[PDB]
Amino acid sequence: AIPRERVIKAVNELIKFTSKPKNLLEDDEEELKKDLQLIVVNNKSFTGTSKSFKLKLLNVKHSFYKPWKEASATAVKDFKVLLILKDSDIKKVSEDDLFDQLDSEGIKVDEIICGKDLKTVYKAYEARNAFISQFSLILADDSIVTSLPKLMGGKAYNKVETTPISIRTHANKEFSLTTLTNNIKKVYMNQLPVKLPRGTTLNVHLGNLEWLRPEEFVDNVELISEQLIKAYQIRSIFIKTNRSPVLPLYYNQDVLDELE
Amino acid sequence: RSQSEREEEWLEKLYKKHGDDYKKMFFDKKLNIYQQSEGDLKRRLLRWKKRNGI
Amino acid sequence: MPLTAVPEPKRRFVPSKNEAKRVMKIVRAIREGRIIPPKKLKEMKXXXXX
Amino acid sequence: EKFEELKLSQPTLKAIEKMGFTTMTSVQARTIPPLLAGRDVLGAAKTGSGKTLAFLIPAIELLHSLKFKPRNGTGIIVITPTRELALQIFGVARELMEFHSQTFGIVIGGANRRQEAEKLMKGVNMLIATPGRLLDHLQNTKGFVFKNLKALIIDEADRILEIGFEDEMRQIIKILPNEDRQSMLFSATQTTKVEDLARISLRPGPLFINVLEQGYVVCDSDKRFLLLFSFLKRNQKKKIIVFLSSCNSVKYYAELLNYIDLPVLELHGKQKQQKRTNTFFEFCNAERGILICTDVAARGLDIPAVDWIIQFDPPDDPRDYIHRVGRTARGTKGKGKSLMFLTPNELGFLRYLKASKVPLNEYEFPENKIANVQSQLEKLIKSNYYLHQTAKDGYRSYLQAYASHSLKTVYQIDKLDLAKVAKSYGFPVPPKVNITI
Amino acid sequence: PEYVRVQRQKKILSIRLKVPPTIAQFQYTLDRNTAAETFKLFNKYRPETAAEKKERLTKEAAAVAEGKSKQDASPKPYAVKYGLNHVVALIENKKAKLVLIANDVDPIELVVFLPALCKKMGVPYAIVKGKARLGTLVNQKTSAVAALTEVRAEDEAALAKLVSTIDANFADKYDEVKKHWGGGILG
Numbered sequence A: 001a002i003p004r005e006r007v008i009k010a011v012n013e014l015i016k017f018t019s020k021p022k023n024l025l026e027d028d029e030e031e032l033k034k035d036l037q038l039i040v041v042n043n044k045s046f047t048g049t050s051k052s053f054k055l056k057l058l059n060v061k062h063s064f065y066k067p068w069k070e071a072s073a074t075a076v077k078d079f080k081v082l083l084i085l086k087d088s089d090i091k092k093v094s095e096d097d098l099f100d101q102l103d104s105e106g107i108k109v110d111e112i113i114c115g116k117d118l119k120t121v122y123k124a125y126e127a128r129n130a131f132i133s134q135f136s137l138i139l140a141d142d143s144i145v146t147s148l149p150k151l152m153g154g155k156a157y158n159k160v161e162t163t164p165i166s167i168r169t170h171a172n173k174e175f176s177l178t179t180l181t182n183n184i185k186k187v188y189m190n191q192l193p194v195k196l197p198r199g200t201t202l203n204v205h206l207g208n209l210e211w212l213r214p215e216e217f218v219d220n221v222e223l224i225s226e227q228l229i230k231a232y233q234i235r236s237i238f239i240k241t242n243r244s245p246v247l248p249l250y251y252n253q254d255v256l257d258e259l260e
Numbered sequence B: 001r002s003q004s005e006r007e008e009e010w011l012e013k014l015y016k017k018h019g020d021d022y023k024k025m026f027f028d029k030k031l032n033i034y035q036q037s038e039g040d041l042k043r044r045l046l047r048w049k050k051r052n053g054i
Numbered sequence C: 001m002p003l004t005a006v007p008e009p010k011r012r013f014v015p016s017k018n019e020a021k022r023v024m025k026i027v028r029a030i031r032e033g034r035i036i037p038p039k040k041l042k043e044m045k046x047x048x049x050x
Numbered sequence D: 001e002k003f004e005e006l007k008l009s010q011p012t013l014k015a016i017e018k019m020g021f022t023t024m025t026s027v028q029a030r031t032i033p034p035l036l037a038g039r040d041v042l043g044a045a046k047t048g049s050g051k052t053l054a055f056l057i058p059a060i061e062l063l064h065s066l067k068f069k070p071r072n073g074t075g076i077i078v079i080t081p082t083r084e085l086a087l088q089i090f091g092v093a094r095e096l097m098e099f100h101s102q103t104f105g106i107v108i109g110g111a112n113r114r115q116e117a118e119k120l121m122k123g124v125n126m127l128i129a130t131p132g133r134l135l136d137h138l139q140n141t142k143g144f145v146f147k148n149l150k151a152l153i154i155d156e157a158d159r160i161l162e163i164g165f166e167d168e169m170r171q172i173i174k175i176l177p178n179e180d181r182q183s184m185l186f187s188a189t190q191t192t193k194v195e196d197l198a199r200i201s202l203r204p205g206p207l208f209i210n211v212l213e214q215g216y217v218v219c220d221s222d223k224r225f226l227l228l229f230s231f232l233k234r235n236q237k238k239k240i241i242v243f244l245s246s247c248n249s250v251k252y253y254a255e256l257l258n259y260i261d262l263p264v265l266e267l268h269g270k271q272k273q274q275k276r277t278n279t280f281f282e283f284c285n286a287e288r289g290i291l292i293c294t295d296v297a298a299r300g301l302d303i304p305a306v307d308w309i310i311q312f313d314p315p316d317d318p319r320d321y322i323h324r325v326g327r328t329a330r331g332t333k334g335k336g337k338s339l340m341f342l343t344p345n346e347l348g349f350l351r352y353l354k355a356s357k358v359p360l361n362e363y364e365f366p367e368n369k370i371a372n373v374q375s376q377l378e379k380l381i382k383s384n385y386y387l388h389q390t391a392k393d394g395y396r397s398y399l400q401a402y403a404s405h406s407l408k409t410v411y412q413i414d415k416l417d418l419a420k421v422a423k424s425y426g427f428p429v430p431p432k433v434n435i436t437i
Numbered sequence E: 001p002e003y004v005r006v007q008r009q010k011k012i013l014s015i016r017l018k019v020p021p022t023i024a025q026f027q028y029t030l031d032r033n034t035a036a037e038t039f040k041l042f043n044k045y046r047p048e049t050a051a052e053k054k055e056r057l058t059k060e061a062a063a064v065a066e067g068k069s070k071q072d073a074s075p076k077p078y079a080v081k082y083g084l085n086h087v088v089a090l091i092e093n094k095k096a097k098l099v100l101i102a103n104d105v106d107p108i109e110l111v112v113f114l115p116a117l118c119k120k121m122g123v124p125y126a127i128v129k130g131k132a133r134l135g136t137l138v139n140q141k142t143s144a145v146a147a148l149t150e151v152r153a154e155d156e157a158a159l160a161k162l163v164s165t166i167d168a169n170f171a172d173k174y175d176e177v178k179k180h181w182g183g184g185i186l187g
Helices: A004-018 A029-033 A065-074 A087-092 A095-105 A115-120 A125-133 A154-158 A177-189 A214-231 A255-259 B005-017 B040-051 C017-031 C038-049 D010-018 D026-037 D051-066 D083-099 D113-122 D131-140 D157-163 D166-175 D192-201 D224-234 D247-259 D273-286 D295-299 D318-331 D347-356 D374-383 D385-403 D418-425 E002-009 E012-016 E032-042 E050-066 E084-090 E113-120 E131-136 E156-171
Strands: A036-043 A081-085 A111-114 A137-141 A165-167 A201-208 A234-241 A248-251 D041-044 D076-079 D105-107 D126-129 D152-155 D183-186 D214-218 D240-244 D264-267 D290-294 D308-311 D337-342 D360-362 E098-102 E125-128 E145-148
Touching: A004 A214, A004 A234, A004 A248, A036 A214, A065 A177, A065 A201, A087 A111, A095 A177, A111 A115, A125 A154, A125 E156, A137 A177, A165 A177, A201 A214, A214 A234, A234 A255, B005 B040, C017 E050, C038 E050, D010 D051, D010 D083, D026 D041, D026 D051, D051 D076, D051 D083, D051 D152, D051 D183, D083 D105, D083 D126, D083 D247, D083 D295, D083 D385, D105 D113, D105 D131, D113 D131, D126 D131, D131 D166, D152 D157, D152 D192, D157 D166, D157 D192, D166 D192, D183 D192, D214 D347, D224 D247, D224 D337, D224 D418, D240 D247, D240 D295, D247 D264, D247 D290, D247 D385, D264 D273, D290 D295, D308 D318, D318 D347, D337 D347, D347 D360, D374 D385, D385 D418, E002 E012, E032 E098, E032 E125, E032 E156, E084 E145, E098 E113, E098 E131, E098 E156, E113 E125, E125 E156
Parallel strands: A081 A111, A081 A137, A137 A165, D041 D183, D076 D126, D076 D152, D105 D126, D152 D183, D214 D337, D214 D360, D240 D290, D240 D308, D264 D290, D308 D337, E098 E125
Antiparallel strands: A036 A201, A036 A234, A234 A248, E098 E145
């Protein structure tokens, strides 16, 4: 596996790093950047030789969306939850139907949007980018997911929050509200998004240090990393703040022998 | 002078949605679409209560 | 700025009252049966065509 | 002593009970037996000691002892420099006159002239007014019952003189009767030209009782309320008091931010004073709270050691603001960081800050971090009639507050883009307010 | 006939004589594609007819007659505005986002202040050609005015570029020649 002890060493090093200190009233976005964890994976041929806008949802022990939301109440940008559903789906599903299910576990859908609404109400780059930039959590039906990228705009596919997440209301022939109900729970608190770019570089976003426990950070990182090792042949792992330099934790030197 | 059945039913919906408080039901969008006056709400609810439901 | 400091009326923001009075007029006419519902009218026409 | 000990009519007793007053402040406890005795007086007291109520009680005693009709006279006349202080004195006086039978009114330059004219045609048994508009109403309004003058008061003759209404005051007193009139006046300090008006006014011989960096944030006038909202969200769980000018904007901003569900306490002259006391008590004991208030309602009461002084609106007295930040620093061992919003027309205020010689810190603004709720604001104002009217009222009273401002060299209405001001209030088109421009 | 003789002798005696510059702002009007897209815009915002109105009324009234009080929800009606005093009424707030003005009205003096009035109020007016084409989009015989205020979010971006299009095509092209005395050349 991976020496958890070394991960605790590195995260305490990063806590000490971010603990190092006419000023702004409203704080710098860069100041918010220099507090956040990003996982970086060197791995052989992370392309599928093709663009992959589909996000892999990794099973994670802890859920950073709740400390996200709790700090987002204090923060300027407010955490919002977007679902994009079919026309008949929105005709059937109502909002209190969602809200009653989500107050059970204490979360909230902000909005639900049809593809019609994407293709006529926000068929304008300014309004569409402004509407997308409000949101952190974007969900979409798996049927609509492969219809999205003409409607969403590539500016939505640039960032990690702005790109949508595959989610399914169906389990049988028709959809069930139970499936969407527990499925938003699965995608919310038990899974984390993964962009899949080209090259040998993978960037995985974890989150601000102030949100979670550092050993809980270590547990989530080691779980994700074992999931990645079992997934892909991996050259190396550097985790860091996007202001900070890298931190080498784990690497496999024989992967590069096995490529060719 | 009694009350009409639709609007007393409307008041009955408001009485169960908010209860008795008026600042919440004043800023209610659904079932206060005419945006009734703060105290007209009180007057109609007191007339409705004296009519029915104490 | 505009010329006049005329206060905005209430009825510009809420659903239209006079509409609703005409609605209740039609409701009273249908309760008296002087106006037939259009679904019932199409039901009448479908039988009367045969 | 106590207010409830002294000889009073029972509706005044009910009034004082409902305003929460039982005890007396010492200088007002001194001046009240001459206030009942019928002598003229001048007085040095701090702004906001309750010195409004100090004259309010025996004035209503005189109106109770005379029992005259609304057609019969005006009697009690109140001269006060600031429109804001006029509204505060009026809002305190409303419930007092409300348990009484007589009549209460407003004369303010910047109000609708046919409104004030029709109220004068009906007659008003207690007048509260600004000095400039009084010459207009005395010279121009016909049939107005002027000949009585049971009494008259001046408040803060320093501020009348510092504005410069004293020649208007001389013309007023030359219009005023003297023999029925008694004159009472409050001014914390005094000068010679104050005493010259005092020698004309006070009909008997009177006995009188005498007892650091700043933040500055230059913002455009549209985005300043948005930036206030953003900074208030970022500094949530920190108690902060915001200083305003107009009570309508206080009530409107409080209702708005409560509609955006972040917890906000309001504090203004239209607020009932027992409720006002409740809000101040809850702010002082809650210690992490948002307090919205005017300048002079904040002046009227001592301030807990705060995380931030934020001043959104232009000041009533900038000199008192310079003394107030100094006494705030020297009184509060806990650090209270003071800031004022600025508009790019207002930078001359800065050099008057450079006249104050206290240091200054510019606090910068990122255009990226903008809360972007202004579309939701405009959709809300197009939705809610009630919020639409309160927004228009905050806008109206804001512009009339600029109209009532003294320092024209710091504030010109001609400088201001009212389109951006309306967009800050949330109107795409500025509503018409009948303001001389 | 007489009336054919007069209607041919009309527009001769006009152009033969000097027209004042507050007239002949008319027929300096909008070109082909821009008026076409303006009509494509306003046909999206047709007002409800009396038949469609009465039909929806009968639907909701039969609903309440069953009762079957379905919900209490409707956003707003959006439509063009077409009453002349109502069009002027939507100015001096201002509320008019676009105004179309017919060139041909037989009492021209009903209309002549409207370009200067939207000029001073800053309202994006445009002079359209033919009040019958206004009446068609508003279910009247003629309309002679066409104000439009409220627009859905789907159409708001089209609105702004149409405004910029008109201010480029009308306010830039014809502004100086608006000041000039038209006509005067004999027939």
